Ligand binder design. Structure first.
Ligand SMILES: Nc1ncnc2c1ncn2[C@@H]1O[C@H](COP(=O)(O)OP(=O)(O)O)[C@@H](O)[C@H]1O
Ligand SMILES: Nc1ncnc2c1ncn2[C@@H]1O[C@H](COP(=O)(O)OP(=O)(O)O)[C@@H](O)[C@H]1O
Ligand SMILES: Nc1ncnc2c1ncn2[C@@H]1O[C@H](COP(=O)(O)OP(=O)(O)O)[C@@H](O)[C@H]1O
Ligand SMILES: [Mg+2]
Lengths: 525, 44, 72, 75, 52, 106, 52, 52, 151
């Protein structure tokens, strides 16, 4: 007997439980619903979605990213929550592949539902899926090709990977321009993996093709009142000092005197202390001074009297980016000028972007920090362009870290499923059927890719399966017209890490969801 | 009876006018009740 | 309804009708390999078509003439 | 189709409504013009009484809702 | 070429038609305020603010 | 037209007298300048009736077929004997068919 | 061949508007066309609406 | 266009082509203007203010 | 533009319509629910079911007959109503086969749902099913054996 279906009642008011059949039904329905929702946004011909928030602000969001779609939805199905967390972790690990992993998990769970309907124990399905995952991972690893040794070939691979990543997003209208932009921005990092060193500035107005990667750097801060607005051959000092009603850090200190003349003397002493600090800063021989915190009226007046540009309130990200792009050292003490390195750039001036004014650093010394100006017709366009560019930058950084690449367009899935089938027809028992279902899901991935374009998905997938059967290990879905072709020639390249992560995460989530035979919910708060 | 993952999608889109018209009066009633109950029950 | 592309099929049929004078060329819904409805024996009454056109035109005119609604 | 959470008036309706509001404001004070004009007695619904012939005072004391009537009062 | 792919959803078409209808309604709303002979709109917000 | 004069305090009786005088003059003028045919010609009378029916009909949804309906109306009226009783002209509405399918039964 | 023929509200018909001093900068029409086309393209690539 | 069976992707590309052609056409109609010409600036400002 | 998904309101209060995907989903869900309910009572090892009436009498009925099960259930899904009427007519025509015909219809509709998901026009499915039904009927007739001559 079960807890719910017993003459005695064992639960609080509002709590309930779902046994094997009901729990499996709910989990499969939730997972399949998530997979069907996130799909149709997959492949070059995928569409976008509108996320209309019901809150007071009623935020409007248009996106093709699977992770952002899955995270910004009210989910009550626990298996749907598992898939959403899978997509979020997929996005955290690498920029791309959220939709692919979600769809793969949904297809695996649908095949598991069919197998359970075929009277197969879930443990057998799990074992078969573990074997299939091992075989597919080995096949994909053997299929990977590395081009990190050759510089020109590696750059071509980076271009192809960026184009493939951007092919499914709104940036595909100007794919070449944004591909070159993203590749240059990533290459300017000189191997550093900190994507926060790349700043994406969204300015409304102008066409999407008006977006550009600045040759230097751009800051959205202001300058003091009496300070120069243009400096050539600037020597930049980056600081993280107070320079605002600067208090001695003895918190118990106080001023106790018997006359106001002494109070005036103490005030003059404080002003003299600030003046001496400014003089020590100026002893470094600088033209532009950048401080992380605010700069009050007296220090900025002193800077203006010395003809030194002072930029205030550049946050931790701002000072880090200026240090990266100019080579300066973030300083908080000014007693050893010889021990502090000063940033250098050819020119600092004010540029007029849209209706806003920004500080432009040109001819920077190092340049290991980038600013990208995004121009668009709507706020939604700018947000989606930023998200797509973020995905492209993340994938490019991953490829820089690990140069192993695989072929997209369903080729990797086709070879994975070919290996899985070769293993399946070599194993007795229902585990062979489980591995066949694994292969069917792997086929279903490029099947959905082709379906999104209105092509003859069944015929194209059959042709791909045959071609991989004879030995054509590079055949894939040629999406230009609706045929199959060599992806080595077509340059539909994709990172090996992304595909491996997609496969492993999808298999893991399908396994953990399939193991559940009882869903118990406490009384909601 | 299946398909609990309804994903009501643009269903509520076509009813925002009526829903918000009802919600304005509901919020006014809730505010009036809260102001009435601010004094009462608290130390009644 | 038959799955073919509407604009392309209709344009091709109209062009064929203009080129060779044959008002019997229509939409091959059953995919019989020919467009000549005389051969396919797709026959409908002339009275039915005339009534269709007349009634549609009359109702469209009557709807267009209305410019005010006074629902309670 | 618009799906704007509010009411909309267009054409002769809004023009007639604005002229209505302006004419009502004018008729409020039309009887206090010229030497044969007569004063008005305003009550501030708390017992406060104001007796005046000045148009500005009358229009300031009255409660006005229509935007065109507000325009005339500010005028 | 034949029957071709069958569109079994019809939801995307409805979404596209709804979006177009909304945009056309907005244009028809702000259509009479165009050119030297266009008039002004008076808008009263949730508060008492009035903007012509 | 008389509202502005009402607003300025004109006595209503003056307006009433002016309306009565103007209406009497207008009716007399209409009777004076109205065109009549003092010949009792059958063809001319029928043409006049048909033109009047067309004018009375060229404002409705049947204005496209106003000549056809006007001819049938003239025929139906002429078939009435001496009192032109409205109950002697039956009107039957049958759903379906074009407006040109409507017929007058002798 | 009348490149500058436009609507003349003062005259009430069609006439050259350069004689009516009705001119506008190129970067108004060009910007409007570009942004409107981009917005239409963005809208066309949408097939579903999701409530958060 | 959509009711005719056209995919909402050929429409976008064709609209992009039309936008490029229209931008070229508008650039063809353009006339160079110098800031030293006060009459053109006054005419532009008057045209802007004509509708208000 | 869908009739329900239009800015103007056409239907009365309480009236609604389900378009292509929604109608197909509803019909398939109802048919599959009916088929799964009726099945598991099929074959020699089938098991009976208890029918508890919600009326005042609360009549108790345990049965294995498919038509009897389908008759005494509150059905709101229209496709489920179609299948129930099919079972009733099958019972009227011949004594047995109600469970078999219901399960066969449900399985056919499940396969139709799969084919529709595979982007196949339902008219093509109907034509293929007509050809298959003709072939199956001919084969079944060709295998029938008659023994009425010998007592
Ligand atoms: N130009 C292309 N040709 C063929 N397939 C492509 C192309 N671009 C992307 N794809 C495929 O589309 C799939 C989904 O990619 P995308 O939608 O961009 O991101 P995500 O992996 O997050 O869904 C990838 O697996 C890739 O193989
Ligand atoms: N005097 C005029 N004669 C003819 N057309 C005019 C005149 N003044 C303005 N226009 C036209 O009216 C159009 C609309 O301008 P306006 O009503 O100010 O709104 P917007 O500037 O937002 O389009 C402009 O494109 C302009 O060409
Ligand atoms: N002794 C048996 N051996 C094998 N199959 C059987 C036997 N008896 C019945 N069946 C099968 O069970 C199926 C269902 O029969 P039953 O449940 O009695 O009625 P219904 O056909 O209405 O379901 C039949 O199609 C028949 O083939
Ligand atoms: Mg992608």
């Amino acid at each position: 007997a079960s807890l719910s279906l017993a003459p005695v009642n064992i639960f609080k008011a509002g709590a309930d439980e779902e046994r094997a059949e009901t729990a499996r039904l709910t989990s499969f329905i939730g997972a399949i619903a998530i997979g069907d929702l996130v799909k149709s946004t997959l492949g070059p011909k995928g569409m976008d979605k509108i996320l209309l928030s019901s809150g007071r602000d009623a935020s409007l969001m248009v996106t093709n990213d699977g992770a952002t779609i899955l995270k910004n939805i009210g989910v009550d199905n626990p298996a749907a929550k598992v898939l959403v967390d899978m997509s979020r972790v997929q996005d955290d690990e690498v920029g791309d592949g959220t939709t692919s992993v979600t769809v793969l998990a949904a297809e695996l769970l649908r095949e598991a539902e069919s197998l359970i309907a075929k009277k197969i124990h879930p443990q057998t399905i799990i074992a078969g899926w573990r074997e299939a995952t091992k075989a597919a991972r080995e096949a994909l690893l053997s299929s990977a090709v590395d081009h990190g040794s050759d510089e020109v070939k590696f750059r071509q691979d980076l271009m192809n990977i960026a184009g493939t990543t951007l092919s499914s997003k709104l940036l595909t209208h100007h794919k070449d321009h944004f591909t070159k932009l993203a590749v240059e921005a990533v290459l300017r990092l000189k191997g550093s993996g900190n994507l926060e060193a790349i700043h994406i500035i969204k300015k409304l107005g102008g066409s999407l093709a008006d977006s550009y990667l600045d040759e230097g750097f751009l800051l959205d801060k202001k300058i003091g009142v009496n300070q120069p607005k243009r400096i050539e051959n600037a020597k930049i000092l980056i600081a993280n000092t107070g320079m605002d009603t600067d208090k001695i850090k003895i918190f118990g200190s106080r001023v106790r005197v018997d006359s106001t003349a002494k109070v005036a003397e103490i005030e003059h002493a404080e002003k003299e202390k600030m003046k001496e600090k400014v003089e020590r800063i100026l002893k470094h021989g600088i033209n532009c001074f950048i401080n992380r915190q605010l700069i009050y009226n007296y220090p900025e007046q002193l800077f203006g009297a010395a003809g030194v540009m002072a930029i205030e309130h550049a946050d931790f990200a701002g000072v880090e980016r200026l240090a990266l792009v100019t080579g300066g050292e973030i300083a908080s003490t000014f007693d050893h000028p010889e021990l502090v390195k000063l940033g250098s750039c050819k020119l600092i001036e004010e540029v007029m972007i849209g209706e806003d004014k920004l500080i432009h650093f040109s001819g920077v010394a190092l340049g290991e920090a980038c600013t990208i100006v995004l121009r668009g017709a709507t706020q939604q366009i700018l947000d989606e362009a930023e998200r797509s560019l973020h995905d492209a930058l993340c994938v490019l950084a991953q490829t820089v870290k690990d140069s192993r690449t695989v072929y997209g367009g369903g080729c990797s899935e086709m070879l994975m499923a070919h290996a899985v089938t070769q293993l399946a027809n070599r194993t007795p028992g229902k585990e062979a059927v489980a591995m066949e279902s694994y292969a069917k899901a792997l086929r279903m991935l490029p099947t959905i890719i082709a379906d999104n374009a209105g092509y003859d998905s069944a015929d194209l997938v059959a042709q791909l399966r045959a071609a991989h059967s004879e030995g054509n290990t590079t055949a894939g879905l040629d999406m230009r017209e609706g045929t199959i072709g060599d992806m080595a020639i077509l340059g539909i390249t994709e990172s090996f890490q992304v595909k491996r992560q997609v496969l492993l995460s999808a298999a893991e989530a399908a396994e953990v969801i399939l193991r559940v035979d009882n869903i118990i919910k406490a009384a909601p708060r | 009876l299946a398909g609990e993952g309804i994903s009501v999608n643009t269903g509520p889109k076509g009813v925002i006018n009526d829903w918000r018209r009802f919600k304005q009066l509901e919020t006014e009633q809730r505010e009036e009740q809260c102001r009435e109950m601010e004094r009462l029950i608290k130390k009644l | 309804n038959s799955g073919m592309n509407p604009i392309q099929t209709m344009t091709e049929v109209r062009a064929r009708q203009v080129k060779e004078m044959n008002p019997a060329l229509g939409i091959d819904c059953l995919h019989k390999g020919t467009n000549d409805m005389k051969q396919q024996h797709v026959i409908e009454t002339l009275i039915g078509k005339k009534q269709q056109i007349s009634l549609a035109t009359q109702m469209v005119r009557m709807i267009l003439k209305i410019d005010d609604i006074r629902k309670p | 189709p618009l799906s704007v959470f509010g009411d909309r008036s267009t054409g002769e309706t809004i023009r007639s409504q604005n002229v209505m509001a302006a004419a009502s404001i004018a008729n409020i004070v039309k009887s206090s013009l010229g030497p044969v004009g007569l004063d008005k007695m305003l009550v501030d619904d708390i017992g406060d009484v104001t007796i005046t012939n000045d148009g500005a005072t009358i229009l300031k004391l009255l409660e006005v809702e229509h935007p065109a009537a507000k325009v005339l009062c500010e005028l | 070429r034949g029957k071709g792919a069958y569109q079994d959803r019809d939801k995307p078409a409805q979404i596209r038609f709804s979006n177009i209808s909304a945009a056309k309604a907005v244009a028809d709303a702000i259509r009479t305020s165009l050119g030297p002979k266009g008039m002004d709109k008076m808008i009263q917000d949730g508060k008492g603010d009035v903007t012509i | 037209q008389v509202k502005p004069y009402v607003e300025e305090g004109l006595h209503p009786q003056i307006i009433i007298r002016a309306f009565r005088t103007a209406t009497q003059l207008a009716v007399n003028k209409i009777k004076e300048i109205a065109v009549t045919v003092k010949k009792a010609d059958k063809v001319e009378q029928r043409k006049l009736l048909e033109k009047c029916a067309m004018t009375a009909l060229s404002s409705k949804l049947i204005s496209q077929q106003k000549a056809f309906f006007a001819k049938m109306v003239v025929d139906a009226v002429m078939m009435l004997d001496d009192l032109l009783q409205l109950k002697m002209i039956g009107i039957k509405k049958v759903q379906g068919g074009a407006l040109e399918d409507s017929q007058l039964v002798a | 061949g009348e490149k500058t023929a436009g609507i003349n509200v003062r005259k009430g018909g069609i006439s050259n508007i350069l004689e009516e001093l009705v001119v506008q900068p190129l970067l108004v029409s060009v910007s409007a066309l570009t942004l409107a086309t981009e917005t239409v393209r963005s809208i066309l690539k949408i097939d579903d609406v999701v409530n958060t | 266009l959509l009711q005719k069976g056209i995919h909402p992707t050929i429409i976008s590309e064709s609209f992009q082509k039309a936008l490029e052609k229209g931008i070229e056409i508008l650039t063809d109609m353009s006339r160079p203007v110098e800031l030293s010409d006060r009459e053109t600036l006054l005419n532009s400002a008057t045209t802007s203010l004509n509708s208000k």
